């Protein structure tokens, strides 16, 4: 239970102490944080991702800061640093002075217009990228893989992750938003070539579906996805009593297998040689498949068939009556059982609801595969964000100072009370030019004022400090891209978040 | 203990009464509520938090209870009646400690609790209508978080607030009347937002079943189904026996056909339209389209039951004698003047125009993007909540806040007149009245006396009237500490809402005021 400044200064004691090493942990020159595990261990993290998990809670507001780092991790997976940075970077200056001006409130609506002038600043500096050209994305998409940096597959997996969210973009809500990712999924492939780590349609099933008898391939015959009751039903659609008598025993087995029959009267008509039964899978049920010349598929689940629903594009059958093709194994279908390494890979290509496409990732080993798998992430995430938002914006102090004086100019434009948060929020922008230089080792001061001067001339339009060169430069020059996607999404979060814990003047039970 | 525990009876209140003062209704700041020990929850609305709060002391025991007792009756005067006991418990605090047996002043507080309402009694307004409650447009303008709907906090507030006020509206089961039944109103993002308007009928949220299901249906018998139309797994049909193969086709053909037979018994039993909040497989649905009947899917629970009420007679929403493989029993007969499946607000939806049993009207609030539909949502619902209580209670006092400043002086005048200590009793009751505008100085960050003392600075005689916010009292603001003539934005209070907390606020203290110790003997 906290109140007043004890919340507010405690809110400062929440995110900032989180965001302290994080700025060293952030930027392209990011300096990892050392951690000390409860075992006596160590974890070296540039992440705002891993720190909050391990580090124990230092303040109730931090538990709220953790989730907005989650929310940004949920939204992207990067910017988790900045959201707790930016919001916590807002908490230190404005509130207490403005509680001395007596308000959480004027700061909120200030934060809201501290939000918009950036959103006002962005549309110029955040300028449309062409999602058509891969390299026009790949410059953003190399900007995604360049900091986290697994360099070998930061090359190919991008073009893969480019194609990943591209091939998983049909996305139809009617508004053509592209959040669409899940269709794009990695594939854990033993052995094989380090290349042919690539995007294929549907979902080739690497999870639970690996069998000596699928035959070795089922191409034209269907993969049949059963939610439904492949096991017998003793009545019509239903079940009746067991055997206490000679009379009851013969009566039971008729409708039992007849249900399996009347299932596989309507199940066999659609031509599987592989029926994947996630539920209703049982010995006699799969033994029937064994006896039906249709592969008995066990140790398989909803994700599988939901991935197979995402693979051939099937709809996992919710009707015990009348199974068909477009139910399960849509199209002529391809179920391709390939051992690259010793795992049978269920390859189900030929996706219906097309543009739902996984990513076949093949290393010579899981690491060199996971090296594709991790580089894929930031790429495809930012690809998703670039395909979502077809814009890019210069990184570093460019967005920082162009909005900084803007908010400052806006603060002077207002010359009111809320100016003071604008005064506080504009500086929140500039800790990043600090952060970028607070990495490289020069004096950000000389450059801050010079980046002020970079605004004095150029309004820091495209000109930020680039963390790894530690100098104040055009990012359209350097091709360093935060998108209006990645940033505004990150900036949007913290804007709410600082308000949130500032909307807390009292913590209670 | 003693006055200590009696103070602990006051302290625990004012302690927790801070959280309901520091968070006052919606404008109260978010308060982090630890559920038990390690689980924290960010929330507000002291009428709420006290319940998620877990009461430590028998003092705040009744507070969470009386606030809820106030809240059970009506949602306002609730987070306050917490404070007001403590606020009186602060008024009689040193009194009980001074010379005072509070029995004197508390019975005087009673007459004060009584005498005061006799202004609230004489304080009413019959037509608040174009004045609204908390102004009119500001029923929604408060309900609207203002971005694209901000100036439409006039425009659509002339809509959604005037909607519940005036539109042809069907209460439960096709009932024209001033709604306490809310209003069916929807939101669909797109087109131009200003184009958001009323539709004549219920606005449906429904999966449209027109494959050749007839869109427009005149004199539409409506079946609104919460029970789905599903389908039933079925074994062999007529006989079992196969001499030649085509029987095995016909034997398994009556799986669809008996329902084809029974869904054209559904024509015979009846409906022209099948609305289903549950599922309709196109298996059943087609049987209607080849029957020439309407079958609509996943009609919104609200929207459907809104139809399922006005549609009239018996409806499958609240009933099931139907299997959906089965023919209807005509427990499914609702009735629509005409169903014209209608293109509205970037939606092709079945729009059931008026009713056979009623004339339905539903506004659809067209979002410029979802954010309107997100923010007008509250504007839909909360300005709905406002006018419903306004239609529920048409006797409502003019002014919320400056009432108390009057009620202070109004009662503080009646104080000096009575005499003795009960003169003093009435004056100390006229004090506690002034904290409710002061807990507005909490959230609006106003200056409590400059707020409240200047509130009291407003009078000729003592009165709160939309006539005079300066020569006398009226209104008050979440925007300021300033009284306002109620139609611009004054804070209206419902009359029934006030006397309750007034009544109740003294009713928490007096027993606490009686209990002389907490502890063992």
């Amino acid at each position: 239970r906290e109140s007043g400044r004890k919340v507010q200064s405690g809110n400062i004691n929440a995110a900032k102490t989180i965001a302290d090493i994080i700025r060293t942990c952030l930027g392209p020159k990011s300096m990892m944080k050392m951690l000390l595990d409860p075992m006596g261990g160590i974890v070296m993290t540039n992440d705002g991702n891993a720190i909050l998990r391990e580090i124990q809670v230092q303040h109730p507001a931090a538990k709220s800061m953790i989730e907005i780092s989650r929310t940004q991790d949920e939204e992207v997976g990067d910017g988790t640093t900045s959201v707790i940075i930016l919001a916590g970077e807002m908490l230190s200056v404005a509130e207490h002075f403005l509680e001395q001006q007596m308000h959480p409130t004027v700061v909120i609506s200030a934060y809201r217009k501290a939000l918009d002038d950036m959103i006002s600043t962005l549309k110029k500096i955040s300028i449309p990228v062409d999602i058509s050209d891969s390299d026009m994305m790949l410059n953003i998409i190399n900007s995604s893989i360049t900091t986290k940096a697994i360099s070998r597959w930061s090359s190919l997996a991008c073009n893969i992750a480019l194609d990943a969210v591209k091939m998983v973009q049909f996305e139809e809500n009617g508004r053509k938003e592209i959040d669409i990712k899940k269709y794009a999924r990695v594939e854990k492939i033993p052995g094989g070539i380090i290349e042919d780590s690539c995007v294929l349609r549907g979902v080739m099933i690497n999870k639970d579906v690996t069998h000596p008898r699928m035959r070795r391939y089922i191409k034209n015959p269907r993969i049949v996805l059963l939610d439904s009751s492949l096991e017998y039903k003793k009545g019509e659609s239903q079940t009746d009593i067991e055997i206490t008598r000679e009379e009851d025993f013969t009566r039971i087995l008729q409708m039992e297998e007849e249900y399996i029959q009347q299932l596989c009267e309507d199940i066999i008509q659609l031509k599987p040689d592989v029926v994947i039964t996630e539920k209703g899978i049982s010995d006699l049920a799969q033994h029937y498949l064994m006896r039906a010349n249709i592969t008995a598929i066990r140790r398989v689940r909803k994700t599988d068939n939901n991935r197979i629903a995402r693979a051939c594009g099937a709809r996992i059958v919710s009707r015990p009556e009348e199974l068909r093709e477009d139910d399960v194994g849509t199209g002529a279908g391809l179920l391709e059982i390939k051992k690259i390494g010793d795992e049978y890979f269920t390859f189900i290509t030929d996706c219906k609801d097309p543009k739902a496409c996984t990513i076949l990732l093949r290393g010579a080993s899981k690491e060199i595969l996971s090296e594709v798998e991790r580089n894929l992430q930031d790429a495809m995430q930012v690809c998703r964000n670039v395909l979502l938002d077809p814009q890019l914006v210069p990184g570093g102090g460019a967005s920082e100072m162009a909005v900084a004086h803007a908010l400052t100019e806006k603060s002077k434009a207002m010359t009111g009370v809320e100016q003071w948060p604008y005064r506080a929020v504009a500086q929140a922008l500039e800790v990043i030019p600090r952060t970028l230089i607070q990495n490289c080792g020069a004096s950000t001061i000389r450059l801050l004022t010079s980046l002020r001067a970079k605004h004095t001339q150029e309004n820091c339009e495209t000109w930020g400090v680039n963390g790894e060169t530690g100098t104040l430069v055009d990012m359209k020059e350097l091709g360093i891209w935060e998108p209006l996607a990645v940033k505004l999404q990150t900036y949007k979060t913290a804007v709410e978040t600082a308000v949130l814990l500032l909307r807390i003047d009292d913590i209670v039970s | 203990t003693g006055e200590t525990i009696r103070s602990q009876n006051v302290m625990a209140a004012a302690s927790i009464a801070n959280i309901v003062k520091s968070s006052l209704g919606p404008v109260g700041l978010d308060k982090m509520l630890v559920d038990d020990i390690g689980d924290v929850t960010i929330t507000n609305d002291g009428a709420t938090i006290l319940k998620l709060l877990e009461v430590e002391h028998p003092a705040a025991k009744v507070l969470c209870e009386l606030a809820d007792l106030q809240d059970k009756e009506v949602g306002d005067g609730t987070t306050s009646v917490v404070i007001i006991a403590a606020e009186l418990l602060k008024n009689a605090d040193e009194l009980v400690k001074q010379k005072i047996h509070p029995t004197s002043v508390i019975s005087g507080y009673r007459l004060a609790c009584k005498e005061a309402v006799r202004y609230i009694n004489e304080n009413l307004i019959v037509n608040t209508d174009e004045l609204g409650r908390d102004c009119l447009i500001n029923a929604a303008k408060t309900s609207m978080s203002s971005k694209i709907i901000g100036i439409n906090g006039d425009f659509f507030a002339n809509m959604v607030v005037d909607a519940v006020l005036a539109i042809k509206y069907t209460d439960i089961r096709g009932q024209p009347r001033y709604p306490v039944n809310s209003v069916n109103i929807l939101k669909a993002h797109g087109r131009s937002q200003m184009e958001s308007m009323l539709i004549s009928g219920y606005a449906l949220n429904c999966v449209v079943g027109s494959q050749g299901m007839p869109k427009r249906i005149v004199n539409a018998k409506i079946a609104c189904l919460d029970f789905s139309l599903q389908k039933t797994k079925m074994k062999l049909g007529v006989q079992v026996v196969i001499t030649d193969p085509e029987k095995l086709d016909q034997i398994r053909q009556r799986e669809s056909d008996i329902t084809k037979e029974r869904i054209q018994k559904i024509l015979a039993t009846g409906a022209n339209v099948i609305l289903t909040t549950g599922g309709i497989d196109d298996m059943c649905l087609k049987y209607f389209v080849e029957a020439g009947a309407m079958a609509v899917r996943r009609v919104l629970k609200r929207d459907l039951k809104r139809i399922a009420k006005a549609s009239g007679a018996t409806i499958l929403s609240t009933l099931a004698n139907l299997e959906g493989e089965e023919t209807f029993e005509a427990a499914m007969l609702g009735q629509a003047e005409e169903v014209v499946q209608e293109r509205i607000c970037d939606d092709e939806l079945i729009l059931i125009k008026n009713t056979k049993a009623r004339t339905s009207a539903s506004i659809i609030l067209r979002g410029a993007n979802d954010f309107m539909c997100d923010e007008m949502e509250r504007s839909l619902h909360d300005a709905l909540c406002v006018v419903k209580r306004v239609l529920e209670s048409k006797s409502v006092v003019p002014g919320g806040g400056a009432v108390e400043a009057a009620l202070s002086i109004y009662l503080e005048n009646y104080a000096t007149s009575m005499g003795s200590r009960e003169q003093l009793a009435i004056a100390e009751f006229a004090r506690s009245l002034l904290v409710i505008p002061n807990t507005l100085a909490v959230n609006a960050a106003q200056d409590s006396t400059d707020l409240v003392a200047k509130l009291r600075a407003f009078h000729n005689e003592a009165q709160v009237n939309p006539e005079r916010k300066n020569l006398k009292w009226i209104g008050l603001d979440l925007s300021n500490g300033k009284p306002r003539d109620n139609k611009q934005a004054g804070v209206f209070e419902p009359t029934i809402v006030k006397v309750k907390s007034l009544k109740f606020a003294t009713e928490a203290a007096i027993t606490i005021l009686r209990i002389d110790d907490l502890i063992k003997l």
Side-chain angles (χ1 to χ4, degrees), chain A residues 1 60 64 102 105 175 235-237 255 259 262 265 319-321 502-509, chain B residues 18-19 22 29-34 40 42 53 56 232-236 252 255 283 369 443 445:
Chain A
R1 293 183 180 175
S64 298
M102 182 62 183
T105 300
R175 191 173 182 171
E236 307 301 319
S237 178
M255 294 293 179
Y259 179 79
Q262 290 296 101
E265 291 299 322
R319 296 180 64 186
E321 179 183 1
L502 181 143
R503 285 175 294 180
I504 311 298
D505 286 346
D506 290 341
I507 297 181
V508 294
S509 296
Chain B
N18 181 30
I19 308 309
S22 61
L29 268 72
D30 292 343
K31 305 298 187 290
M32 294 180 73
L33 272 70
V34 173
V40 62
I42 297 183
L53 294 172
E56 297 175 351
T232 59
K233 170 60 176 170
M234 293 172 287
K235 291 293 185 66
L236 297 177
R252 292 176 297 180
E255 295 175 349
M283 185 165 177
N369 287 334
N443 302 134

Side-chain angles (χ1 to χ4, degrees), chain A residues 207-470:
Chain A
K207 295 179 67 66
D208 296 342
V209 191
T210 291
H211 291 157
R213 177 186 176 90
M214 292 182 75
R215 307 290 183 271
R216 294 292 179 270
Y217 301 94
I218 300 304
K219 293 289 188 291
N220 194 29
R222 302 289 175 266
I223 182 53
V224 170
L225 292 65
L226 288 171
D227 278 342
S228 300
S229 180
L230 182 64
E231 187 177 2
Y232 53 86
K233 294 289 183 290
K234 297 182 176 72
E236 307 301 319
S237 178
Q238 63 282 1
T239 298
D240 285 344
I241 62 177
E242 62 184 343
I243 300 100
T244 187
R245 292 174 61 187
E246 296 177 351
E247 181 68 14
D248 293 343
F249 179 81
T250 301
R251 180 182 62 197
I252 294 163
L253 180 63
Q254 293 180 337
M255 294 293 179
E256 285 185 346
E257 181 64 16
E258 180 176 359
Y259 179 79
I260 295 184
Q261 187 174 356
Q262 290 296 101
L263 289 172
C264 294
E265 291 299 322
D266 294 344
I267 295 184
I268 198 171
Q269 65 179 20
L270 70 93
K271 178 56 175 170
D273 194 5
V274 283
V275 170
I276 175 158
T277 307
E278 60 201 340
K279 290 189 296 185
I281 185 71
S282 178
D283 289 344
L284 179 63
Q286 64 186 19
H287 182 199
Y288 176 77
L289 292 176
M290 295 296 293
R291 294 170 297 180
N293 286 285
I294 302 165
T295 290
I297 295 175
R298 62 188 178 279
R299 294 185 298 276
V300 295
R301 299 174 190 170
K302 289 179 177 177
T303 60
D304 293 343
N305 287 341
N306 286 282
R307 297 294 176 268
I308 300 180
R310 196 177 78 191
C312 53
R315 54 173 296 278
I316 60 183
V317 293
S318 294
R319 296 180 64 186
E321 179 183 1
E322 186 179 2
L323 273 73
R324 290 190 298 273
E325 178 179 2
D326 184 67
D327 286 343
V328 290
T330 58
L334 296 174
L335 176 134
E336 310 169 353
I337 306 310
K338 295 184 172 74
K339 294 167 63 181
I340 300 160
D342 283 343
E343 176 184 0
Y344 292 95
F345 298 152
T346 301
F347 287 93
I348 302 178
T349 55
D350 180 65
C351 183
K352 186 176 296 297
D353 71 13
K355 303 303 288 184
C357 301
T358 42
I359 307 146
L360 171 61
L361 297 180
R362 296 168 58 190
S365 296
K366 179 57 169 60
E367 284 300 321
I368 188 159
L369 186 151
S370 297
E371 296 174 352
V372 188
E373 178 174 0
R374 291 170 294 181
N375 294 133
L376 190 75
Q377 193 69 60
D378 284 346
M380 71 186 288
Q381 289 177 332
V382 176
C383 293
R384 178 181 62 82
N385 298 133
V386 172
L387 295 176
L388 181 62
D389 180 9
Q391 293 188 335
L392 48 76
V393 49
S399 298
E400 309 310 320
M401 187 69 73
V403 181
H405 285 87
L407 299 176
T408 303
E409 295 168 349
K410 188 181 178 64
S411 70
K412 300 302 286 186
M414 175 173 173
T415 194
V417 289
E418 296 182 353
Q419 67 168 11
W420 296 97
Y422 307 146
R423 299 176 185 274
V425 178
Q427 297 176 338
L429 298 166
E430 299 308 315
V431 68
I432 302 302
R434 296 179 180 84
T435 294
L436 296 175
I437 295 149
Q438 292 168 334
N439 286 336
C440 64
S443 65
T444 187
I445 54 178
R446 298 182 184 274
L447 277 70
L448 290 173
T449 299
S450 295
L451 188 64
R452 304 288 195 272
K454 293 296 286 185
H455 192 287
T456 301
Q457 56 174 21
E458 292 165 344
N459 299 128
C460 293
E461 288 168 346
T462 177
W463 291 271
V465 59
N466 192 30
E468 287 176 352
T469 191

Side-chain angles (χ1 to χ4, degrees), chain B residues 248-434:
Chain B
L248 179 62
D249 291 344
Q250 185 174 355
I251 291 184
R252 292 176 297 180
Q253 185 65 60
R254 296 184 183 277
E255 295 175 349
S256 296
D257 290 348
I258 64 183
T259 305
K260 294 177 182 178
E261 184 67 13
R262 286 195 295 273
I263 294 214
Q264 289 183 334
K265 293 186 176 76
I266 290 173
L267 294 176
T269 304
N272 290 284
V273 171
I274 313 312
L275 299 181
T276 304
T277 294
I280 298 180
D281 289 344
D282 283 343
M283 185 165 177
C284 285
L285 188 146
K286 181 189 78 179
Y287 307 153
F288 300 100
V289 314
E290 64 190 343
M294 174 172 277
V296 183
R297 294 170 292 185
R298 291 171 179 78
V299 184
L300 176 62
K301 179 61 175 171
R302 176 182 176 174
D303 292 345
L304 177 138
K305 76 187 188 73
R306 299 297 178 86
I307 300 136
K309 66 184 185 69
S311 63
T314 56
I315 203 87
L316 196 72
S317 304
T318 59
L319 299 173
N321 295 131
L322 177 68
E323 295 178 350
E325 187 71 21
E326 185 182 2
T327 183
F328 288 1
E329 68 281 2
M332 284 164 275
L333 297 172
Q335 297 168 338
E337 186 279 333
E338 65 187 343
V339 167
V340 178
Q341 187 168 354
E342 182 177 1
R343 179 177 179 82
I344 192 67
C345 306
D346 282 344
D347 285 340
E348 285 186 349
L349 299 166
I350 287 80
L351 273 68
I352 293 200
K353 289 181 178 179
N354 297 286
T355 301
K356 291 291 283 190
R358 175 53 187 151
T359 58
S360 181
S362 297
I363 295 192
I364 296 197
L365 300 169
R366 300 184 182 179
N369 287 334
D370 278 338
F371 299 100
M372 169 164 171
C373 297
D374 293 344
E375 304 310 320
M376 288 299 295
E377 183 177 3
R378 296 180 182 175
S379 177
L380 199 161
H381 302 164
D382 181 66
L384 183 67
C385 295
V386 175
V387 181
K388 289 167 63 179
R389 304 179 183 87
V390 179
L391 296 171
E392 179 275 336
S393 64
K394 289 183 172 71
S395 296
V396 296
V397 308
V403 176
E404 302 305 321
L407 288 179
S408 178
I409 289 169
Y410 165 78
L411 187 64
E412 186 177 3
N413 295 336
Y414 182 78
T416 302
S417 297
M418 181 172 283
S420 176
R421 178 176 289 97
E422 305 311 321
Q423 174 164 347
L424 175 66
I426 298 164
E428 286 300 319
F429 193 84
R431 306 295 173 271
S432 294
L433 302 173
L434 300 178

Side-chain angles (χ1 to χ4, degrees), chain A residues 66-308:
Chain A
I66 291 174
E67 294 304 321
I68 66 111
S69 178
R70 302 292 182 272
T71 299
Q72 192 61 54
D73 189 3
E74 296 168 352
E75 187 177 7
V76 174
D78 289 345
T80 65
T81 59
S82 179
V83 294
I84 59 204
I85 294 248
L86 294 176
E89 187 67 13
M90 294 176 181
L91 295 176
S92 296
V93 176
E95 57 184 339
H96 52 81
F97 292 152
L98 295 167
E99 297 301 324
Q100 293 167 336
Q101 296 296 102
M102 182 62 183
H103 56 274
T105 300
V106 166
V107 185
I108 292 181
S109 64
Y111 285 149
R112 297 303 304 278
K113 283 181 291 298
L115 170 66
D116 67 15
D117 191 5
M118 178 168 176
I119 293 185
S120 298
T121 301
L122 290 176
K123 270 64 184 178
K124 291 185 298 295
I125 185 193
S126 298
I127 178 179
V129 60
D130 291 344
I131 61 181
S132 295
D133 179 65
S134 296
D135 290 343
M136 182 64 180
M137 290 179 69
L138 179 60
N139 63 33
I140 305 177
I141 301 315
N142 286 334
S143 296
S144 64
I145 51 83
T146 187
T147 299
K148 303 292 184 292
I150 296 90
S151 296
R152 177 177 57 197
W153 298 109
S154 296
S155 296
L156 277 72
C158 291
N159 290 336
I160 303 307
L162 290 173
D163 294 345
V165 184
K166 286 176 179 178
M167 283 182 69
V168 307
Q169 175 178 356
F170 62 92
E171 179 177 359
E172 183 67 14
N173 58 343
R175 191 173 182 171
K176 302 307 287 185
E177 67 181 341
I178 311 309
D179 64 356
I180 189 163
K181 189 188 74 65
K182 67 179 184 298
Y183 302 155
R185 179 185 178 175
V186 301
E187 296 302 323
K188 296 183 182 299
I189 301 318
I193 179 59
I194 66 158
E195 291 182 351
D196 189 64
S197 294
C198 52
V199 290
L200 277 63
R201 293 180 62 185
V203 184
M204 67 208 90
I205 309 296
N206 60 345
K207 295 179 67 66
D208 296 342
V209 191
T210 291
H211 291 157
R213 177 186 176 90
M214 292 182 75
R215 307 290 183 271
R216 294 292 179 270
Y217 301 94
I218 300 304
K219 293 289 188 291
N220 194 29
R222 302 289 175 266
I223 182 53
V224 170
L225 292 65
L226 288 171
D227 278 342
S228 300
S229 180
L230 182 64
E231 187 177 2
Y232 53 86
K233 294 289 183 290
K234 297 182 176 72
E236 307 301 319
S237 178
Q238 63 282 1
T239 298
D240 285 344
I241 62 177
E242 62 184 343
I243 300 100
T244 187
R245 292 174 61 187
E246 296 177 351
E247 181 68 14
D248 293 343
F249 179 81
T250 301
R251 180 182 62 197
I252 294 163
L253 180 63
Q254 293 180 337
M255 294 293 179
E256 285 185 346
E257 181 64 16
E258 180 176 359
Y259 179 79
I260 295 184
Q261 187 174 356
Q262 290 296 101
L263 289 172
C264 294
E265 291 299 322
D266 294 344
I267 295 184
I268 198 171
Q269 65 179 20
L270 70 93
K271 178 56 175 170
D273 194 5
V274 283
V275 170
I276 175 158
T277 307
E278 60 201 340
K279 290 189 296 185
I281 185 71
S282 178
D283 289 344
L284 179 63
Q286 64 186 19
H287 182 199
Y288 176 77
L289 292 176
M290 295 296 293
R291 294 170 297 180
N293 286 285
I294 302 165
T295 290
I297 295 175
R298 62 188 178 279
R299 294 185 298 276
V300 295
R301 299 174 190 170
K302 289 179 177 177
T303 60
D304 293 343
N305 287 341
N306 286 282
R307 297 294 176 268
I308 300 180

Side-chain angles (χ1 to χ4, degrees), chain B residues 54-165:
Chain B
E54 296 174 350
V55 293
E56 297 175 351
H57 193 277
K61 182 182 172 64
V62 62
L63 292 177
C64 182
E65 294 173 349
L66 180 65
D68 190 4
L69 174 59
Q70 178 64 57
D71 191 5
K72 291 185 174 75
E73 294 183 354
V74 66
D76 292 344
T78 62
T79 186
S80 295
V81 69
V82 180
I83 298 147
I84 311 305
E87 186 69 15
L88 288 171
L89 288 173
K90 288 183 292 294
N91 284 276
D93 193 5
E94 180 63 16
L95 293 178
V96 178
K97 298 180 176 74
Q98 184 175 354
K99 58 179 177 293
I100 309 291
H101 287 85
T103 58
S104 299
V105 296
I106 195 67
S107 60
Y109 292 140
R110 293 298 177 191
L111 297 175
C113 180
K114 271 66 179 180
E115 176 68 15
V117 306
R118 289 172 177 79
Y119 177 73
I120 291 95
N121 295 337
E122 65 184 339
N123 206 35
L124 297 167
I125 183 166
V126 55
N127 288 282
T128 188
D129 295 342
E130 291 180 351
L131 282 68
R133 186 176 70 197
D134 292 345
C135 173
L136 171 68
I137 57 200
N138 196 32
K141 184 70 170 174
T142 52
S143 299
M144 299 181 188
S145 177
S146 296
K147 299 300 287 185
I148 58 197
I149 62 181
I151 64 104
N152 293 336
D154 298 348
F155 176 76
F156 298 121
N158 287 284
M159 187 176 292
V160 298
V161 180
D162 291 345
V164 188
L165 189 146

